[PDB]
């Protein structure tokens, strides 16, 4: 029973994206260590907004699959999901293979699900200091 109207409050004015329950500062440190400053400030913010939007989409999709149910397009949030899908399916093409090269996963399912923390990650991957640094 996550706060849904407070998720509707966090819809941005362009159509992208503590309730998410994720270590954000350690995630910023991880993405800085992987070298995200080589894309410009505009490219860095455009990639962080894509990663945050896909993380919120994977969170809501895990919530909907636990209930049972680029194809996200309930009546109370159909417009936000629609404009989010229309944003993501335009902005993803600028960054191909940005999930392996930032070392988050193979594709967006793998990357957002291993960052979401609902699946275990193997020991040879460097993804251990993003889900276990918040447990202190």
């Amino acid at each position: 029973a996550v706060p849904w109207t407070e998720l509707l409050s966090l819809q941005t004015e362009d159509g992208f994206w503590l309730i998410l329950n994720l270590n954000t500062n350690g995630l910023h440190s991880f993405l800085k260590q992987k070298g995200i400053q080589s894309l410009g400030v505009k490219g860095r913010e455009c990639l962080l907004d894509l990663i945050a939007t896909m993380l919120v989409l994977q969170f809501i999709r895990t919530r909907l699959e636990k209930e049972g149910i680029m194809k996200m397009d309930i009546p109370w949030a159909f417009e936000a999901i629609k404009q989010a899908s229309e944003w993501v399916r335009r902005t993803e093409g600028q960054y191909p293979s940005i999930c392996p090269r930032l070392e988050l996963g193979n594709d967006w399912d793998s990357a957002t699900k291993q960052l979401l923390g609902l699946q275990p990650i193997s020991t040879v991957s460097p993804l251990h200091r993003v889900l276990h640094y918040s447990q202190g």
Binding site: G35, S38, K42, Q94
Partner: protein, 199 residues
């Protein structure tokens, strides 16, 4: 893979940028250098790169932002102010502060240079067979406006309002008259009009 060394220190892990079709990348220098094309660049000097694919920044090239080209349909043109003395894609010399238009007969798509400025996209002014218009401050043969003067355009004609020009009241419809109708109209200057054979 990279084997390390004692006297060599890895600073950061930089990432390339993906340039699709009809885009370019704006990136300034950080130091007196030479770019990939082989041209000397001073500190702070910005330029563009127009190769398609993965583009890897150099050690002295701060990538700023991606620049996407502007698609020129037959009903739109591009108003551009120059920012310094340069030569654009057609190969004409520009001066600082100068304005001009770019149409489809130049290119079907135009990527805005760092020496230029997008002032706006000018829609075409078209006139029907029953229309005329008056142009405030028209451009003469010298490429410069005649300030204060006017020019009357009549007939079927589609054109762009060049930088400086303006319509006096808009697209106006021509007076059409039967034999039951007449117009009273006064001169303002000595004029001649040879509608028929006599003047």
């Amino acid at each position: 893979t990279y084997i390390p060394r004692k006297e060599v220190e890895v600073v950061e892990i930089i990432q390339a940028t993906i340039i699709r079709q009809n885009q370019a990348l704006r990136l300034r220098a950080r130091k007196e250098c030479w770019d990939r094309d082989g041209k000397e660049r001073v500190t702070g000097e910005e330029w563009l790169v127009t190769t398609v694919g993965a583009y890897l920044p150099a050690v002295f090239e701060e990538v700023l932002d991606l620049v996407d080209a502007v698609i020129l349909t037959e009903k739109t043109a591009l108003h551009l102010r120059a920012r310094r003395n340069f030569r654009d894609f057609r190969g004409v010399s520009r001066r600082t502060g100068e304005e001009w238009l770019v149409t489809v007969q130049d290119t079907e798509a135009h990527v805005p240079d760092v020496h230029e400025e997008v002032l706006g996209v000018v829609p075409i002014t078209t006139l029907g067979p029953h229309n005329y218009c008056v142009i405030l401050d028209p451009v003469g043969p010298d490429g410069k406006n005649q300030l204060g003067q006017k020019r009357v355009v009549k007939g079927e004609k589609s054109f762009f309002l060049q930088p400086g020009e303006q319509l006096e009241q808009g697209i106006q419809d021509v007076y059409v008259l039967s034999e039951q109708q007449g117009l009273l109209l006064r001169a303002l200057q000595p004029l001649e009009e040879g509608e028929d054979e006599e003047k």
